[PDB]
Enzyme design. Sequence first.
Site, PDB file in Angstrom:
ATOM      1  N   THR A  34       0.845  -1.055  -0.020  1.00 50.03           N
ATOM      2  CA  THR A  34      -0.018   0.028   0.031  1.00 50.03           C
ATOM      3  C   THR A  34       0.958   1.281  -0.093  1.00 50.03           C
ATOM      4  O   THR A  34       1.785   1.598   0.818  1.00 50.03           O
ATOM      5  CB  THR A  34      -0.858  -0.099   1.332  1.00 50.03           C
ATOM      6  OG1 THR A  34      -1.979  -1.141   1.036  1.00 50.03           O
ATOM      7  CG2 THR A  34      -1.641   1.294   1.460  1.00 50.03           C
ATOM      8  N   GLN A 110      -4.198  -8.026  -5.126  1.00 48.90           N
ATOM      9  CA  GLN A 110      -4.824  -8.125  -3.883  1.00 48.90           C
ATOM     10  C   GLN A 110      -6.135  -7.392  -3.526  1.00 48.90           C
ATOM     11  O   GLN A 110      -6.093  -6.118  -3.719  1.00 48.90           O
ATOM     12  CB  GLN A 110      -3.896  -7.847  -2.818  1.00 48.90           C
ATOM     13  CG  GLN A 110      -4.311  -8.254  -1.352  1.00 48.90           C
ATOM     14  CD  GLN A 110      -3.271  -7.958  -0.355  1.00 48.90           C
ATOM     15  OE1 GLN A 110      -3.134  -6.733  -0.332  1.00 48.90           O
ATOM     16  NE2 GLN A 110      -2.980  -8.812   0.297  1.00 48.90           N
ATOM     17  N   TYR A 192      -7.943  -7.519   8.439  1.00 49.30           N
ATOM     18  CA  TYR A 192      -8.848  -6.628   7.806  1.00 49.30           C
ATOM     19  C   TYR A 192      -9.980  -7.784   7.720  1.00 49.30           C
ATOM     20  O   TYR A 192      -9.999  -8.685   8.464  1.00 49.30           O
ATOM     21  CB  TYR A 192      -8.293  -6.425   6.145  1.00 49.30           C
ATOM     22  CG  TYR A 192      -7.237  -5.372   6.346  1.00 49.30           C
ATOM     23  CD1 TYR A 192      -7.562  -4.010   6.527  1.00 49.30           C
ATOM     24  CD2 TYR A 192      -5.941  -5.686   6.428  1.00 49.30           C
ATOM     25  CE1 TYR A 192      -6.635  -2.855   6.537  1.00 49.30           C
ATOM     26  CE2 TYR A 192      -4.767  -4.538   6.509  1.00 49.30           C
ATOM     27  CZ  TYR A 192      -5.402  -3.298   6.718  1.00 49.30           C
ATOM     28  OH  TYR A 192      -4.367  -2.159   6.517  1.00 49.30           O
ATOM     29  N   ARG A 239      -3.704 -14.683   0.880  1.00 51.13           N
ATOM     30  CA  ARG A 239      -2.776 -14.015   1.831  1.00 51.13           C
ATOM     31  C   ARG A 239      -3.171 -14.361   3.233  1.00 51.13           C
ATOM     32  O   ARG A 239      -4.274 -13.846   3.675  1.00 51.13           O
ATOM     33  CB  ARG A 239      -2.140 -12.760   1.712  1.00 51.13           C
ATOM     34  CG  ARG A 239      -0.912 -12.669   2.491  1.00 51.13           C
ATOM     35  CD  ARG A 239      -0.205 -11.203   2.036  1.00 51.13           C
ATOM     36  NE  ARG A 239       1.357 -11.153   2.525  1.00 51.13           N
ATOM     37  CZ  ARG A 239       1.979 -10.385   2.348  1.00 51.13           C
ATOM     38  NH1 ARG A 239       1.501  -9.091   2.380  1.00 51.13           N
ATOM     39  NH2 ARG A 239       3.393 -10.505   2.212  1.00 51.13           N
ATOM     40  N   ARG A 346       9.524  -3.908   1.433  1.00 52.81           N
ATOM     41  CA  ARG A 346      10.142  -2.848   1.753  1.00 52.81           C
ATOM     42  C   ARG A 346      11.467  -2.374   1.051  1.00 52.81           C
ATOM     43  O   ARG A 346      11.725  -1.313   0.473  1.00 52.81           O
ATOM     44  CB  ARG A 346      10.589  -2.716   3.200  1.00 52.81           C
ATOM     45  CG  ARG A 346       9.264  -2.401   4.159  1.00 52.81           C
ATOM     46  CD  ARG A 346       9.709  -2.404   5.639  1.00 52.81           C
ATOM     47  NE  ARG A 346       9.709  -3.770   6.041  1.00 52.81           N
ATOM     48  CZ  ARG A 346      10.256  -4.303   7.160  1.00 52.81           C
ATOM     49  NH1 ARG A 346      10.654  -3.318   8.305  1.00 52.81           N
ATOM     50  NH2 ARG A 346      10.063  -5.725   7.467  1.00 52.81           N
TER      51      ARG A 346
HETATM   52  C1  FMN Z   1       4.330   0.601   3.271  1.00 52.29           C
HETATM   53  C2  FMN Z   1       3.700  -0.869   3.687  1.00 52.29           C
HETATM   54  C3  FMN Z   1       2.608  -1.194   2.788  1.00 52.29           C
HETATM   55  C4  FMN Z   1       2.030  -2.427   2.964  1.00 52.29           C
HETATM   56  N1  FMN Z   1       0.916  -2.749   2.051  1.00 52.29           N
HETATM   57  C5  FMN Z   1       0.643  -4.062   2.306  1.00 52.29           C
HETATM   58  C6  FMN Z   1      -0.807  -4.536   1.485  1.00 52.29           C
HETATM   59  O1  FMN Z   1      -1.508  -3.487   1.014  1.00 52.29           O
HETATM   60  N2  FMN Z   1      -1.308  -5.843   1.512  1.00 52.29           N
HETATM   61  C7  FMN Z   1      -0.399  -6.685   2.400  1.00 52.29           C
HETATM   62  O2  FMN Z   1      -0.824  -7.845   2.404  1.00 52.29           O
HETATM   63  N3  FMN Z   1       0.708  -6.361   2.890  1.00 52.29           N
HETATM   64  C8  FMN Z   1       1.208  -5.031   2.883  1.00 52.29           C
HETATM   65  N4  FMN Z   1       2.408  -4.892   3.605  1.00 52.29           N
HETATM   66  C9  FMN Z   1       2.718  -5.962   4.318  1.00 52.29           C
HETATM   67  C10 FMN Z   1       4.170  -6.157   3.130  1.00 52.29           C
HETATM   68  O3  FMN Z   1       3.403  -7.086   2.141  1.00 52.29           O
HETATM   69  C11 FMN Z   1       5.273  -7.174   3.846  1.00 52.29           C
HETATM   70  O4  FMN Z   1       4.476  -8.482   3.817  1.00 52.29           O
HETATM   71  C12 FMN Z   1       5.854  -6.623   5.004  1.00 52.29           C
HETATM   72  O5  FMN Z   1       6.309  -5.448   4.716  1.00 52.29           O
HETATM   73  C13 FMN Z   1       7.393  -7.734   5.175  1.00 52.29           C
HETATM   74  O6  FMN Z   1       8.030  -7.914   4.044  1.00 52.29           O
HETATM   75  P1  FMN Z   1       9.203  -7.137   3.925  1.00 52.29           P
HETATM   76  O7  FMN Z   1      10.198  -7.288   5.222  1.00 52.29           O
HETATM   77  O8  FMN Z   1       9.966  -7.365   2.598  1.00 52.29           O
HETATM   78  O9  FMN Z   1       8.998  -5.395   3.816  1.00 52.29           O
HETATM   79  C14 FMN Z   1       2.830  -3.684   3.592  1.00 52.29           C
HETATM   80  C15 FMN Z   1       4.072  -2.973   4.149  1.00 52.29           C
HETATM   81  C16 FMN Z   1       4.513  -2.071   4.190  1.00 52.29           C
HETATM   82  C17 FMN Z   1       5.805  -1.701   4.832  1.00 52.29           C
HETATM   83  N1  NCA Z   2      -3.352  -4.183   3.746  1.00 47.50           N
HETATM   84  C1  NCA Z   2      -2.146  -4.588   4.665  1.00 47.50           C
HETATM   85  O1  NCA Z   2      -2.301  -5.598   4.767  1.00 47.50           O
HETATM   86  C2  NCA Z   2      -1.199  -3.412   4.991  1.00 47.50           C
HETATM   87  C3  NCA Z   2      -1.236  -2.191   4.673  1.00 47.50           C
HETATM   88  C4  NCA Z   2      -0.332  -1.255   5.409  1.00 47.50           C
HETATM   89  C5  NCA Z   2       0.636  -1.847   6.265  1.00 47.50           C
HETATM   90  N2  NCA Z   2       0.690  -3.026   6.441  1.00 47.50           N
HETATM   91  C6  NCA Z   2      -0.421  -3.991   5.955  1.00 47.50           C
END
Ligand code: FMN
Ligand code: NCA
Lengths: 404, 404
Positions: A34, A110, A192, A239, A346
Site C-alpha cells: 500500500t 490483492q 482486515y 494471503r 520494503r
Molecule cells: C508501506 C507498506 C505497505 C504495505 N501494504 C500491504 C498491503 O497492501 N497488503 C498486504 O498484504 N501487506 C502489505 N504490507 C506488508 C508487506 O507486504 C510485507 O509482508 C511486509 O512489509 C514484510 O516484508 P518486507 O520485510 O520485505 O517489507 C505492507 C508493508 C509496508 C511496509
Molecule cells: N493491507 C495491509 O495488509 C497492510 C497495509 C499497510 C501496512 N501493512 C499492512
Amino acid sequence: SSVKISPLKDSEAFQSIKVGNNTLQTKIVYPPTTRFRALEDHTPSDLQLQYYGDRSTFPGTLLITEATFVSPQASGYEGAAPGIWTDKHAKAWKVITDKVHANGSFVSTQLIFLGRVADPAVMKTRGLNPVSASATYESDAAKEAAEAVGNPVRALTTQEVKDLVYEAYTNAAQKAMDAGFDYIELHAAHGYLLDQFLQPCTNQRTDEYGGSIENRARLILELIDHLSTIVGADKIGIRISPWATFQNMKAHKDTVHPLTTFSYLVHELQQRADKGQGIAYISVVEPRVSGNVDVSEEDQAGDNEFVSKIWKGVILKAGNYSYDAPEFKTLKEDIADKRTLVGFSRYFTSNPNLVWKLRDGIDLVPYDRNTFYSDNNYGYNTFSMDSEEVDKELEIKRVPSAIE
Amino acid sequence: SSVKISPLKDSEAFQSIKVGNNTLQTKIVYPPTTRFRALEDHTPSDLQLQYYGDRSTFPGTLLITEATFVSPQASGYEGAAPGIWTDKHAKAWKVITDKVHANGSFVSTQLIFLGRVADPAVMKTRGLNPVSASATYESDAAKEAAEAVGNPVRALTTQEVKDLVYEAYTNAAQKAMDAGFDYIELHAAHGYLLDQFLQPCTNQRTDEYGGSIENRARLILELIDHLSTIVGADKIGIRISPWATFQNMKAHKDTVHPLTTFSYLVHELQQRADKGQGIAYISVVEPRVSGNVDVSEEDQAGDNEFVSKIWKGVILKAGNYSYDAPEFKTLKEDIADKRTLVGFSRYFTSNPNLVWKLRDGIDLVPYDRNTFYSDNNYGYNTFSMDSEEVDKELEIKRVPSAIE
Ligand SMILES: Cc1cc2nc3c(=O)[nH]c(=O)nc-3n(C[C@H](O)[C@H](O)[C@H](O)COP(=O)(O)O)c2cc1C
Ligand SMILES: NC(=O)c1cccnc1
Ligand SMILES: Cc1cc2nc3c(=O)[nH]c(=O)nc-3n(C[C@H](O)[C@H](O)[C@H](O)COP(=O)(O)O)c2cc1C
Ligand SMILES: NC(=O)c1cccnc1
Ligand code: NA
Ligand code: NA
Ligand code: NA
Ligand code: NA
Ligand code: NA
Ligand code: NA
Ligand code: NA
Ligand code: NA
C-alpha cells in the site's frame, strides 16, 4: 544503510516455476504494498503505471498489487488507495497490466475489504457504516472515533455476507479479469475483513458464518469456491498472517490458536487441490513481521512450517528476508523445496530493479519509511531516477494524475 | 581470440518487441545453425535438447532451429540433420520446445529442402533423385558425382510442385505445430530449393512456376499463402540471402539482379501485410556473409536497405555483427528503427549464454570451426561446461542418443 548481499544468480531464486497457468523466471516477488498514490476516486494513476512498470523489467517476475478495494463498502482509508469495482478502474488497471505483460512479467491484484478498521468519517461520507463479522473495535480509541460521528461498527447480516460472495467479490473478480490481471488474491491477513471473519476475537456470529472454527472459515472458503468457478482456481491466491497482531488481532493469545485456525483453512485448500481445484498459491507472512512492524525472535510465538507440511502447492513467503544477508541462509533454505517464492516489499520500494540487484549481488538502496504513505511522487517513483536529476520540490508537488 | 565488447544492456537490444503473437525481451536472436547432431533417422537427440535449452536462459529470447528437413525428398546430407515429417520427429522436438518455453523463450523451426545440392548417393538409398526447379548442378563436380551413381538431378513436374505445397510443407507445418514450435521459417536462402526456384540461374521452367520474375516467385508465395491458412501468418517467417553466392548462386551476376528478385518478393509480402495477412518476420543475411563464408567489403555488391524500405514489419538481420565490436556501431544503427532483430550464429555456438554476455559486455569465447559439423558432443555442448571438467576423449565418443 545499503544492504550488502551476495549474488543469487546461481540459486533456486533463478530457476523457473509454474504458478497456476504461468511460468515465472525468478522466485523473487513484489508483495502487495500500500502506497496511497491512486487518484481520489480510486482509479489507478499515472504514477502507479510507472511504478509497477519499473518493477517488471526482469522478465517473468510476479508483481502483486497494493491492496485494492473490492467495492465502496470495502474502503475506509483517508489516503487514496485504488479500487477495482468500476469499468473506469478496470480500464486504468489494464494500462498497467499491459505494461507489465509487455515485459514478460505477471501481476496479481490483492483484493481488500477493510471491515472494522474502516475510518468512520470516511464511511459516513458514503452513507455507509463500518462493517465486520461482529460489531467490535480494534481499540477504545477506534470505538470513540466511530461513536463520535454517530457511525458505529455493525455486524453484516447473513444476506450481506452472501452479497459479499455473489456481488462484491464477484464484480471485483470480473473487473480484475477485464483489467487483465493474471491472478486475484484474497486478503485474509493483517486484521482486515476476511481475517476478522476467521478468528474468534473478531467473529462471534451465531449464523452459519460464526460460532465454530469451521463456520468462521466458511465465508473465505465460499469465496475460494465461487471465484474458482468464475475465473478458475489457477487464477486465485490468498494471503494469511497467522502470527500477526496487527490491528489488534489476538493471534496466539486468542481462544483459538492460529495454528488451529490456519491449519484448518490450509488443509481445506489442499483438499480442493486434491480434487483438481488447487488454487495458484498461498501467500504467508513470516513471523519476523506483523503487518508493517518487525517482531523480535523473543516475541515470535510460532512459524509457518505447518503450511509447507499441509499444502503441496506454491507458497509465497515474505518478511524481512534480508535479516541474514549477505548470505541469505534462511531464504535459500526456504526455497530449497522448489515450490516456494520469496517476497521483498520494503526493499522493492527503494529498489525498482530489486530482482536484478539480488541476482548479481548489488548493494540495496535503503528504503525511506517517511515516504511510504505520503500522497505525492517524492520517494515513490524517484528511486528510478538518478539522484542528480531529482527535483525534490517539484516531485513533492507531483500528485497522482489520470493515466495518459 | 576472445572478442572484447561493450555492454548492450541500455540499448534497443534489450527493449521488448512483438513478433507475431509473442513478445521478445531481447532483440538478440540465435539464427538457424546446422550442426549435424541429430539421430541417424533424423529425430532430434539428447544433445540437441541440452543445446537449445542452454541458449534459452535469457527469458524472452527467440531461437531458430537448424535447418530441418520437411520430408524424405527434402533431405540429402551425409551428416545427421533433423527432420519434422513424422510423429516421432514431432514428439522429440516437443521435448525441446517445452524446455525452451519453460524458460520463457520462443522457438522457430527452419524448414529446408535441399534440392539440386542433395547428395546423389544419399538420395539413391531412398530410391529418390535429387530434384530442383530445373535440372541443373552447382558444379561440374556435382554433375559428375550424380551421373556416376546413375542418379542425375531432375526437374520437379508441375504436379510435384503442387505436392510440395499441399503435402510436403503442409505436413511439416502440421508436425511443427504438434511439436509446439512458435513459428515456422521457410528457408529461401543460400541456394537451397526455394532459392533455386526464385532465381533464373537455377529456374528455367516453362510452366507457371518459371519463365518470369513473377512465375519464379510463385511457389514461395503459394507456400506463404497456404501455410498462412494452416498455422496463421503470425507463425510464419522466411529467410533470404539476396547477395549470397553460396552453392553457386549467380546473385548480382545473374540475368535478373537480386535487387529485382527480392524486392519483388518482399513487396508482395508487404501487400499481404496490408490486407491483414502480414507474416511474423523476414530474416535477411547481411552482405558481410555468404552462407558460411565471410565476404570482403570490396566483393559486396549491394545491401539490404531495400528490405527496410519496402517491408514495414519485423526484420531479422545476421552476418558478422561483431565486426565493429566493441562499440557495435552497425548493430545499434540497424536496430534503431525498433522493428529489427539482430542474430549471432557463430558466436552463439561457443557462447551458450551469448545474450547475457552481450547484455553485460563480457568477452566472447572464440568459436571452433573444426567442430561446427562433426558428429559428436565435443565442441557442441562442451561450451556449457567448465573447461576443467571436460573429458575430451569421452565427449568425442559421445554421439547423439534418444531423448530420455
Ligand atoms: C508501506 C507498506 C505497505 C504495505 N501494504 C500491504 C498491503 O497492501 N497488503 C498486504 O498484504 N501487506 C502489505 N504490507 C506488508 C508487506 O507486504 C510485507 O509482508 C511486509 O512489509 C514484510 O516484508 P518486507 O520485510 O520485505 O517489507 C505492507 C508493508 C509496508 C511496509
Ligand atoms: N493491507 C495491509 O495488509 C497492510 C497495509 C499497510 C501496512 N501493512 C499492512
Ligand atoms: C556452422 C554453420 C551452420 C549454419 N547453418 C545454417 C542453417 O541451417 N540455415 C541457415 O539459414 N543458415 C545457416 N548458417 C548461416 C548462419 O545462420 C548465419 O547467417 C551466418 O553464419 C552469419 O552469421 P554469424 O556471422 O553471426 O555467424 C550457418 C552458418 C554456420 C557457420
Ligand atoms: N542451411 C544453410 O543455409 C547453411 C548450412 C550450412 C552452412 N551455411 C548455410
Ligand atoms: Na523488457
Ligand atoms: Na486505522
Ligand atoms: Na493476522
Ligand atoms: Na520451503
Ligand atoms: Na529460466
Ligand atoms: Na554439397
Ligand atoms: Na542466395
Ligand atoms: Na533497421
